[PDB]
Amino acid sequence: MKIAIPKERRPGEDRVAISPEVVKKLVGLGFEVIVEQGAGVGASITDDALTAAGATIASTAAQALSQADVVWKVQRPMTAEEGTDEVALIKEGAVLMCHLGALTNRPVVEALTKRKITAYAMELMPRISRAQSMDILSSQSNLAGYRAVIDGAYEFARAFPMMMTAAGTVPPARVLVFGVGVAGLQAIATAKRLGAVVMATDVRAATKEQVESLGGKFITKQAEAVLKELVKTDIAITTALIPGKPAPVLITEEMVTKMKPGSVIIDLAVEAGGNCPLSEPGKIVVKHGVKIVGHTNVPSRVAADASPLFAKNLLNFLTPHVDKDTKTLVMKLEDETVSGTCVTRDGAIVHPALTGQG
C-alpha cells in the first residue's frame, strides 16, 4: 500500500514525480508515500515540505522502492547497461508509471518485463477529452514553449517590448515561431505578452486561426515568404519534433547566414536532430553572428512548475482506480487510459511494436 518516488538520476533531469499537495491526496487515498531524500530539491521541493505533507523520506532509491507497490518517476528507469540498474530496484510484480519513452526504448520495456512489472507509459495517454488532465506531453510541452521565450530574451541583447522614451524609441523585438503545437502556442502567447511583434508558420493551415487568436501573424514561394520574415526576425523559435522520426529541418544554415547579427534561434527539437542543423544538444552555438541555442531538457528548466503538473497528471490517472475505504488499488484493465498506456504486464509485452527487433 506503498507508493514510492525516487530522485531522477539521468543527466539533465531536475523534475520529480511528486509535490506536497499530491502527497496529501495520495495519503488521503490510503497510501503510504515514500520519497528519496533530496528528490525534489531541483524542483524547489524540500524533504521537510514533503514530510509536512505526510510523506516519509528514504535515504536511497533502493530503500525508497524496496517495498513499493507503485512507483512514480519522471523519466524511464535506467538499466544495468546504462549504469545504475534502477529497474532492479523495483519490486517484482509492482506497478510503474512514468514517461517511459516506450516506443523508442524497447530494452527498458524488456528489462521491466523480466521482473514482471506492470508499466504504464504515460506518454501514450489516449487522446480523449476525459484524459486531458492525465496528459503529460501537454503539461510539459506548454512550459517548454514559455521557457523558449525566456531563454531567447535572455540571450538577446535587445529588449523585447517597444519603448517610447525621452532618449528615443526602443523598437520591439520580432519573433518567428515555427510549429504551432502546444509549445509553439505558448511561445506565441509569451512572446506576445512581452511586447514583441510575433509571427508564426506551420504547414497545417488549420493553425493560422489559433495563431491569430493569440495576436500573432500567420505567414502566408512559401519558403520565400518565411525567408522574407526570417531575415528581419530577431528570435526564431522552432518547436517541430515529431516522435519516432527525425526533426524536420526548418532553418538551414544557409538561411542563418541571411539572418541579422545578434539574432537568436531557440531549437526545441535539438533532441531529434533539431529543426536547425547547427544546433547542438546542451549548447549555445555561435555561428554567422547568430546564436543557435539547443538546451536539452527544457521542461526541466521549469522544474518547479513542471513537477507539480507531472505529479497531478499521474494522480488523475491513478485516482479512479483506488478504493480508499479498503486502501486497495485495482487498475481497471478495460479502462481506455489503462489499456492504452500499458506496455507490459505480468511478464508479457503488450505493445505490438516492442516484442522484438523490427
Strand-pairing partners, residue 62, are none
Nearer CB in complex with its own copies: 170/272: 170
Q: Is 134 annotated as a binding residue?
A: yes
Q: How far apart are CA 134 and CA 112, in angstroms?
A: 23
Nearest distance from C-beta of residue 42 to its own copies, angstroms = 8
Nearest distance from C-beta of residue 161 to its own copies, angstroms = 7
Nearest distance from C-beta of residue 296 to its own copies, angstroms = 16
Q: Is 19 annotated as a binding residue?
A: no
Q: Is 78 annotated as a binding residue?
A: no
Cell numbers at residue 60, please? 536511497
Nearest distance from C-beta of residue 38 to its own copies, angstroms = 11
Does residue 325 contact residue 331 with C-beta atoms inside 8 Å? no
Does residue 264 contact residue 153 with C-beta atoms inside 8 Å? no
Nearer CB in complex with its own copies: 151/202: 151
Q: Is 204 annotated as a binding residue?
A: yes
Nearest distance from C-beta of residue 130 to its own copies, angstroms = 10
Question: Rounded to the nearest 5°, which phi and psi values hold at 318?
Answer: -85, -40
Q: Which residue has the cell 512548475?
A: 305
**Nearest-5° angle of CA 15, CA 19, CA 25?**
145
Q: Name where the chain breaks: residue before each gap, C-N > 2.5 Å.
A: 220
Q: Is 135 annotated as a binding residue?
A: yes
Nearer CB in complex with its own copies: 120/156: 156
- Residue from 146, 104, 95 nearest 124 by CA: 104
Does residue 315 contact residue 292 with C-beta atoms inside 8 Å? no
Give the footprint of its own copies on this chain (CB under 8 A).
14, 41-46, 49, 132-133, 135, 138-139, 142-143, 146-147, 150-151, 153-154, 156-159, 161, 163, 165-168, 170, 190, 193-195, 260-262, 289, 301-305, 308-310, 312-313, 316
Give binding residues for NAD(+) as ranges: 132-135, 182, 202-204
Give binding residues as ranges: 132-135, 182, 202-204
